[PDB]
Design a binder for this molecule. Structure first.
Ligand SMILES: CC(=C/C=C/C(C)=C/C(=O)O)/C=C1\CCCc2cccc(C)c21
Ligand SMILES: CC(=C/C=C/C(C)=C/C(=O)O)/C=C1\CCCc2cccc(C)c21
Lengths: 11, 214, 214, 11
């Protein structure tokens, strides 16, 4: 879950 | 240790450049992306495990965003300035059915910030304290998050007293807006969940995601 | 000015001597009477106009009572001690359907109080700060209520640093449990309104009155 | 309104 959040935090 | 207020102010300066309810929801989604970048700029934040980073943001995004647009609305008359460059007047919010919460925001947050002339360094630290919520459920290391919170307000108190020597109670006065932010933050969320239930009022992906479980 | 912590501690010492939910509601009603006497013992409180005295108590009674039984539950294992001399264990609360809120109380309040060894003088001041809520709607003179709040935490900070010189962050740590108290206070109220709606679980006159409008 | 509260505060 929380697709968008993880992607942004990881970049 | 290693929680300079200068770095906190930088994070703030780095991100800060018809239905009034619809415009607010869009502004919230837009700001959610900016919130993550802001967080990454907060000392030691990105050093926490990715999971706790998600827990902290999902737990305080609402209070974090509310605090931001409120401080940004100090100069504004009776209303707030959205990140989209739009203005939501007190009467407009009232005609949309959210006047009550909107009044609490103007009375307990916007006005109080304008009255004590809360600066950007102070806003930053407060948001940093909110971000570092040791009570967030699921934290792999709440004690560590707690340690960061203490370093933040320790630096904030230092910032104060030094910049506002004549106001020995400024530090406590800043901290005492958190209870209001927490209360107003919870009410705005209830409204949002209702807007979603009703189906009306468009809600973008990021904002929608924040409404996901847990 | 004229807000000695000794008077605050005295107010505390002056009042402090099968369905677990029913027992909690009864304890709450019982404590509501003791809350008024406690308030009258708080410096300058009774000097405010009777109406603002009603507004302040009706606005914080829940947070005031929660803070009290929580601090009273520090020595307790996994549960709380009611003013009636009854013990509500974590499992018992869970078997009644209120485990979630009960856990927040133990995790965010009881445990945190026990960990930092919050004393009675500190509890008192915090409750005094809650009592003096300048945000309470209807106040004939919110500015005056605000002034009293500032005198309270000003004395609290003085109490600290002096009694706990080795803990320069104790003052802020105490103030930082208010956001949790405010949040937990709001959730307990929601439950209470639900208990009333459902009709089950007896509710006495005083507690019932607090559920009246506004 | 608030019968009980007023009576107690006044005494
Ligand atoms: C949760 C939340 C976030 C605000 C985001 C904004 C408006 C950010 C910005 O413009 O900087 C507040 C909302 C979002 C949805 C519910 C609501 C109702 C009345 C007033 C407000 C401010 C709100
Ligand atoms: C509003 C409130 C007041 C507590 C009063 C007590 C228990 C006072 C005392 O014993 O000192 C809390 C309630 C009262 C009703 C709802 C509720 C549900 C779960 C747990 C609790 C503590 C509560």
């Amino acid at each position: 879950k929380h697709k968008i959040l993880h992607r942004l935090l990881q970049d | 240790e290693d929680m300079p207020v200068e770095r906190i102010l930088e994070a703030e300066l780095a991100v800060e450049p018809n239905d009034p309810v619809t415009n607010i929801c869009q502004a919230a989604d837009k700001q959610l992306f900016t919130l993550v970048e802001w967080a990454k700029r907060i000392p030691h934040f990105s050093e926490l495990p990715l999971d706790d980073q998600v827990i902290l943001l999902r737990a305080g995004w609402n209070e974090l965003l509310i605090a931001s647009f409120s401080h940004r609305s100090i100069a504004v008359k009776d209303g707030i300035l959205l990140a989209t460059g739009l203005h939501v007047h007190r009467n407009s919010a009232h005609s949309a059915g959210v006047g009550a919460i909107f009044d609490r925001v103007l009375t307990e947050l916007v006005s109080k910030m304008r009255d004590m002339q809360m600066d950007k360094t102070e806003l930053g630290c407060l948001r940093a304290i909110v971000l570092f919520n040791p009570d967030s459920k699921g934290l792999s290391n709440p004690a560590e998050v707690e340690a960061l919170r203490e370093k933040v307000y320790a630096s904030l108190e230092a910032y104060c007293k030094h910049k506002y020597p004549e106001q020995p109670g400024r530090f406590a006065k800043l901290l005492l807006r958190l209870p209001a932010l927490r209360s107003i933050g919870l009410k705005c969320l209830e409204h949002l969940f209702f807007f979603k239930l009703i189906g009306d009022t468009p809600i973008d992906t990021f904002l929608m995601e924040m409404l996901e479980a847990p």
